Symmetry: C2
Subunit: 178 residues, 2 copies
């Protein structure tokens, strides 16, 4: 509770234009910014999971990071992140936090025309159930929905997205769209 | 309670990025990003251009820099930044720069005369306790007040600390 508010959290978000996608990680402790991570992924590509795990394995904080937060299960548009794989390879649980429910049928209608639709379908399936609690939607790897909920709450400063996600979004957007 | 804009850079053998961070009471509110030439001449323009751009531009109390030296020796004309932006500039440094050695280690580059003038206009270096500052558009005393107001932990302006972390992650991490 009070205790979990002090745990070290990694928040990741992206930004992309017509040509480049960057992915930013931010490490916070009680909202206090301690470090950043950076990488680039292929737009609508297939490398996001590998790229994200490799990025984390470069953190000097990896043994102290208690949770990874993500804004969805895709980055760079349609570059899916296998959250179970991230959990397994990094040993850090993952909470996906979405302030808008994704339209998964719509998403698939796009995905079905991309390279290796079979892998993409599998990655979406392993993300599991979308849980509605409060005004946000979550998916998780390595946590029950209740545990995920506690972690999201503990990661908030002002507003409804985990603090390091909010900050990584601001960085990534500045790199691309500025 | 002011918004402060803290700028830092990072570079390697190929690229130099410059990152701006806007904080209010240490709370991160926004970021700015540009690239400049290593050991080049475009930093002042790029920095002014970056500030203009931005959505907090008329809310910024001052701009903090960790030196005038971005991208190695791509020097920032702080008087020009202040004149063009109307935002005062405070340079905050942990180490008293040996400007004798600085003038020597630069003679190799194109248009040294231009560079020499940029060094000169930054003006007097003041020991402000513990750090050293230069200013454009504020007195030592007003600058001192703003530096103190911008600290969270440690002796460097919070948004400078945070822009360093970002820039270094992009280039080196």
């Amino acid at each position: 509770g009070n205790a979990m508010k002090k745990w070290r959290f990694l928040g990741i978000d992206d930004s992309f234009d017509d040509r480049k996608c960057c992915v930013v990680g931010c490490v916070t402790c009680g909202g206090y910014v301690e470090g950043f991570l950076y990488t680039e992924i292929d737009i609508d590509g297939l490398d996001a999971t590998d790229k994200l795990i490799s990025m984390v394995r470069r953190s000097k904080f990896r043994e102290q990071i208690k949770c990874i937060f993500l804004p969805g299960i895709t980055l760079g548009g349609f570059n899916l992140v296998d959250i179970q794989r991230v959990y397994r390879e990094t040993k850090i649980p993952v909470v996906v936090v979405m302030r808008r429910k994704p339209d998964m049928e719509e998403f698939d209608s796009a995905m079905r025309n991309l390279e290796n639709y079979e892998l993409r379908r599998k990655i979406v399936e392993v993300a599991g159930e979308i849980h509605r609690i409060g005004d946000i939607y979550i998916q998780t790897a390595g946590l029950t929905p209740s545990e995920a909920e506690k972690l999201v709450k503990a990661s908030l400063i002002k507003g409804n997205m985990p603090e390091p996600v909010r900050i990584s979004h601001l960085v990534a957007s500045a790199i691309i769209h500025g």
